[PDB]
């Protein structure tokens, strides 16, 4: 295996090394506005080295945006792609690429055979061309590497089966800033090109200017270069017609010929297209060649892309006709005339690589590397989009649950095959594409319409709902006695029980375990751990007394907690935001234990009176002028006092101090070590009363950011053996810190209100001397080095933090564990921040055409890991990555992929077993199983099982680490007949595994197997 740690990366272009270099001054550079005027030799093209030209017709059509999938699919993209098939048809030399599969399936699907053997056939031809084959064009900033591959393997399966093609080439010209999560899992998924396009302005001229535009892109720690795709930056301001003929766009916008008018559309530049005529047709190629000749300066081949295209165009039959005469005339002129020296023609995005690469392997060409991300993009002057990294954060969170969800209802359904009137398939694809849906760039970034985003979480929400169905009968299933099983397919025999999601304060959406003598004595749960290792975690229950004890199914006590139901009011009468006690409904904890990929079954029973293996927390209320908080039959009763600093510690993990306020003020990692400071504090940021406001895109603060003014918070205080907590009102954000004997967890109930034009964020501050140095997470799959830069503005230092982010010194080191995408920053050494909601009057001038004032109570969750990292064997300074410790790791998966809990629906559970997987392999703790998959029906002869095994990198810092077992993924099944490496979305066999064995990844990398069934 390649080290990932300890050999720095020798490539051309390092972004972070850029960044450091680059001056980032905004200067007009002409009608190039961001650049300079380019000039070229007019003798560098003759008869014996022509400049090829590519135009590329294209189509951008966003399945969601200012109106729903469905809305723009009736009103746009159906007429776009019957149009197409129609223009393309009837037209063999004109060309036409397509991105979104989401919206082709569903045309598709709705056409009649006969024009299905027509589409089929201009596929075939090569005149339709899918590009990248995802259901969508995915967000990269906030999205999860594991829904990137998912959205790209529910498109190009499709693809596969119905159209017989997977694409090799991606066009992705809209997110906003690129991410190198893309190549890493394209190119582990056959690509060799792919396409980009919104890169900050500075950017584009720094590579323009180096002819650095195409390169080969890498990973930050990849020291050989096997992760490396090739990649085309466009050079311009946008994909339109305008910024994509060369450098002038008075001049390209004359070559869109749906701005003549009755399109009614127009050139903001005020010169409207003509019509090329045998008059014109000289002077029109002129100008265009020459635009297109200065665009050839910015690259290094005789090769050139010219897409011609824009949202939602292709339209019209009319329009159609428009841009393809007139290109042709452009074309049979041009190359007709030697003069130029040129060859132009409609190509696909294919043609123009392939024409690139031969032209690299004719020694006209050597290609540059480079590393880094495309973080974080301004489009013009300080107009940085780091706005969406928090936009509509109840719908971000929201996909973070909907991620594990399906991950748990593929792997726990994928041991067994179903018959087809179980459902199990149909409602999987509906999970699949509903999540994979949203990972669209209007989607997760939280920049579409308030009717937009409500179809997108009532789509979500239909997914969680098939999920549950699916987990729910594959448990029934794993643990009931097999001649005892007696499914039906449209019963509920187990209700999920999640605590964190839509969670406490935001919906009451679990189920109490009603038990009592005249009822019901006793009660299963279940719970699940999709990861490949034994895993503990606690886990809770309401319970309609607090009289229950816990036992397994061997009937072995259990140690439990119970502690009371608390809601947090906002008293309209009082004026105070305070916690009320449920009098019926309490809380039961215990710690389940639970095989690798497996199951485990408790039993909940109720007593008469105090169970000798259940304890019960005490309960403090900090404020002045307390009332009574009864508490039902709970036996412990609530004590009061006035504000004021308190510590704790639970089992033998840290002990934590907090201020009166109710917040962290330091952490002691042992009984005999230093109190750490550590301070939580919340503040806001406003919006700019002239000049550019912040939008759903945007953030333009007015200044740094100031504390929120917090009064005197009521803190509840709640301290049990096993679980203990504090917990803050404070305004907008309830504040928890929960300790179970590790790393706190925070939640936040973020609920901003009526506070117009204010962003809220949570910061920590520190004495760790980071300087100007922090680390964040690009997709969940790396964490990638940051430096704080003070000649850009303080949005520009605002990155993604997807799910996590740390700061250290040469001995301690600081990490936020987040189970949502938010945006952060480190601002001043010692500090991170997190962005916890947004609520902004204005649109911000990118066409969504409204301010974020939906906003709806959110429960955000972390977890907060400080430690010694002295003895940490890390990356030199020069080495642009980072790695999380073990300790951090597991934190995250805490988070995002927590045990799921099943709750038995009926009295009486005939047949029920104790365990699922106690025979399962127990992986290292840096190895996922990140996708099991089963990939064929019941009655495929021959069963194909899929899996994503990644493993991560985890610092040494001189634990042992020892007895784990070596996971063979294909023989998880029975009577494996065949084991195969493919790629990441299973498509394409590489490699036939001798012995059937799967062999495990090294560090930093992911791989795919199939496992084949007799
Ligand atoms: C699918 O495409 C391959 C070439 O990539 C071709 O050989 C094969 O016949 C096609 N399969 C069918 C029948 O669709
Ligand atoms: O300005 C950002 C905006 O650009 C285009 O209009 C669209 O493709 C949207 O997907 C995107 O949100
Ligand atoms: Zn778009």
């Given at each position: 295996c390649q080290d990932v740690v300890q050999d720095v990366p020798n490539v051309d272009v390092q972004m972070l090394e850029l960044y450091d270099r680059m001056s980032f001054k905004d200067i007009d550079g002409g009608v190039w506005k961001q650049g300079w005027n380019i000039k070229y030799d007019p003798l560098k093209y003759n008869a014996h080295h022509k400049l090829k030209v590519f135009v590329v017709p294209h189509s951008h059509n966003d399945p969601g945006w200012i109106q729903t999938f469905e809305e723009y699919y009736q009103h746009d993209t159906k007429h776009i792609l019957s149009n197409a098939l129609r223009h393309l048809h009837d037209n063999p030399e004109m060309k036409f690429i397509w991105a979104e599969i989401s919206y082709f399936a569903r045309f598709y699907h709705d056409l009649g055979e006969n024009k299905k053997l027509q589409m089929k056939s201009i596929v075939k031809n090569g005149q339709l061309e899918f590009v990248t084959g995802g259901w969508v064009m995915p967000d990269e900033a906030n999205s999860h590497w594991r829904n990137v591959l998912l959205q790209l393997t529910e498109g190009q399966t499709w693809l596969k089966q119905f159209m017989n093609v997977t694409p090799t080439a991606s066009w992705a010209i809209a997110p906003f800033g690129h991410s190198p999560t893309m190549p890493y899992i394209l190119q582990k998924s056959g690509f060799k090109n792919m396409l980009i396009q919104r890169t900050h302005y500075s950017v584009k001229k720094e590579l323009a200017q180096q002819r650095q535009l195409e390169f080969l892109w890498r990973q930050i720690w990849d020291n050989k270069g096997d992760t490396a795709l090739f990649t085309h930056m466009m050079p311009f301001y946008s994909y339109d017609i305008p910024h994509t003929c060369g450098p002038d766009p008075k001049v390209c916008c004359q070559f869109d010929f749906k701005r003549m008018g009755s399109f009614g559309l127009s050139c903001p530049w005020k010169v409207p297209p003509r019509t090329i005529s045998d008059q014109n047709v000289a002077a029109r190629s002129d100008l265009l060649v020459d635009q297109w000749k200065k665009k050839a300066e910015l690259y290094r081949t005789n090769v050139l892309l010219i897409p011609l295209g824009d949202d939602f165009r292709f339209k019209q039959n009319t329009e159609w006709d428009v841009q393809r005469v007139n290109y042709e005339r452009l074309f049979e002129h041009i190359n007709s005339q030697?003069?130029?020296?040129?060859?132009?023609?409609?190509?696909?995005?294919?043609?123009?690589?392939?024409?690139?690469?031969?032209?690299?392997?004719?020694?006209?060409?050597?290609?540059?590397?480079?590393?880094?991300?495309?973080?974080?993009?301004?489009?013009?002057?300080?107009?940085?989009?780091?706005?969406?990294?928090?936009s509509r954060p109840y719908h971000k969170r929201m996909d973070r649950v909907l991620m594990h969800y399906v991950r748990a209802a593929e792997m726990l359904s994928a041991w067994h095959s179903w018959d087809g009137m179980a459902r199990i398939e149909e409602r999987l694809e509906q999970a699949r594409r509903e999540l994979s849906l949203f990972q669209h760039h209007d989607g997760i970034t939280g920049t579409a319409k308030t009717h937009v985003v409500v179809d997108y979480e009532q789509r979500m929400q239909e997914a969680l709902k098939a999920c549950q169905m699916v987990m729910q009968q594959s448990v029934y299933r794993l643990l009931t006695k097999p001649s005892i099983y007696s499914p039906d397919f449209s019963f509920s025999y187990f209700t999920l029980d999640d605590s964190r999601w839509p969670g406490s304060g935001v919906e009451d959406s679990r189920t109490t375990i009603i038990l009592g003598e005249d009822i019901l004595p006793s009660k299963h749960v279940v719970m699940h751990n999709t990861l490949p290792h034994w895993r503990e975690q606690l886990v809770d229950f309401y319970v309609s007394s607090p009289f229950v004890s816990v036992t397994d199914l061997a009937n072995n006590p259990v140690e439990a907690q119970v502690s009371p139901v608390w809601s947090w009011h906002h008293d309209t009468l009082t004026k105070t935001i305070h916690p009320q006690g449920s009098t019926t409904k309490y809380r039961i904890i215990f710690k389940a234990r639970v095989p690798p990929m497996g199951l485990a079954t408790y039993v909940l029973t109720i007593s008469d009176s105090k169970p000798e293996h259940t304890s019960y927390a005490s309960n403090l209320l900090l404020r002045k002028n307390p009332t009574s908080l009864p508490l039902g039959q709970y036996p412990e009763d609530v004590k009061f006092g006035d504000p004021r600093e308190i510590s704790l510690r639970v089992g033998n993990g840290p002990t934590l101090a907090f201020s009166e306020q109710g917040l962290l003020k330091s952490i002691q990692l042992t009984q005999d070590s230093p109190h750490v400071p550590v301070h939580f504090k919340f503040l806001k940021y406003g919006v700019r009363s002239h000049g550019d406001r912040s939008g759903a895109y945007l953030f333009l603060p007015n200044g740094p950011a100031s504390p929120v003014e917090l009064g005197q918070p009521v803190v509840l205080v709640t301290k049990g053996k096993l679980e203990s907590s504090v917990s803050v009102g404070l305004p907008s954000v309830v504040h928890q810190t929960i300790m179970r004997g590790g790393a706190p967890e925070i939640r936040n109930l973020v609920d901003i209100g009526s506070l117009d034009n204010t962003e809220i964020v949570m910061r920590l501050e520190t004495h760790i001397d980071s300087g100007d140095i922090f680390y964040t997470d690009l997709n969940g799959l790396q964490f990638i080095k940051r430096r704080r830069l003070d000649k850009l503005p303080l949005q520009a230092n605002y990155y993604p933090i997807p799910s996590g982010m740390f700061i250290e010194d040469a001995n301690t080191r600081l990490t936020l564990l987040t189970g949502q995408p938010l945006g952060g920053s480190s601002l001043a050494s010692g500090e991170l921040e997190i962005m916890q909601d947004r609520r902004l009057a204005s649109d911000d001038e990118r066409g969504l055409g409204q301010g974020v004032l939906d906003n709806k109570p959110v429960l955000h969750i972390y977890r907060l890991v400080l430690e010694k990292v002295n003895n940490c064997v890390r990356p030199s300074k020069l080495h642009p990555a980072g790695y999380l410790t073990s300790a951090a790791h597991k934190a995250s998966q805490s988070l995002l992929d927590p045990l799921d809990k099943f709750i038995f629906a009926e009295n009486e559970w005939i047949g029920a077993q104790g365990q699922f997987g106690g025979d399962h392999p127990s992986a290292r703790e840096d190895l996922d199983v990140s996708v099991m998959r089963r990939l064929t029906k019941s009655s495929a002869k021959t069963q194909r099982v899929g899996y994503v095994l990644h493993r991560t990198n985890l610092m040494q810092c001189g634990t042992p680490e020892e007895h784990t077992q070596k996971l063979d993924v294909c023989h998880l099944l029975p009577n494996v007949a065949r084991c195969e490496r493919t790629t990441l979305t299973f498509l394409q066999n590489l490699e036939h595994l001798d012995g059937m064995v799967a062999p495990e990844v090294c560090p930093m990398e992911t791989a795919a197997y199939v496992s084949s069934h007799s």
């Open positions: 030697a003069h130029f020296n040129v060859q132009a023609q409609f190509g696909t995005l294919q043609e123009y690589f392939d024409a690139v690469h031969q032209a690299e392997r004719a020694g006209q060409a050597e290609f540059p590397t480079l590393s880094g991300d495309f973080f974080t993009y301004a489009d013009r002057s300080d107009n940085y989009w780091s706005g969406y990294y928090t």
